RNA sequence: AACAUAAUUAAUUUCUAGACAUCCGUUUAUGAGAGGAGAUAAGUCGUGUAAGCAUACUGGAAAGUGUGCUUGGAAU
């Protein structure tokens, strides 16, 4: 178990990494969106 | 009236709601009233100024008279 733990705890912090740029991409998705929504609105 | 949500399988919602309330007008019939043309059939008094056509007037209303036309009258 001593030799998996440092595996285990290696893998996470990647994932953190992972998880912390898919959910700023998820982010700024949503701004640009409600940007074009502003410019629907203007339009119409 | 018709947007937007979403989107590291992809889908959701939208994809409306008002207003016909009812005409103006239109056809069929009940039909007061008044005639017209028939049916049943005996009455009624009348009925020789050639006839008819068109038209006018007069006839209690078949007719008479005027005007033109016709022979589907007569005429050596
Ligand atoms: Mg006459």
């Given at each position: 178990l001593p030799a998996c733990?440092?595996?285990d705890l290696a893998t996470?912090?990647?994932k953190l990494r992972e998880w912390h740029?898919?959910?700023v991409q998820?982010?700024?998705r949503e701004?640009?969106?409600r940007?074009?929504?502003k410019q629907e609105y203007?339009?119409?």
């Open positions: 733990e440092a595996e996470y912090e990647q740029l898919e959910r998820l982010i700024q701004q640009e969106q940007e074009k929504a203007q339009a119409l």
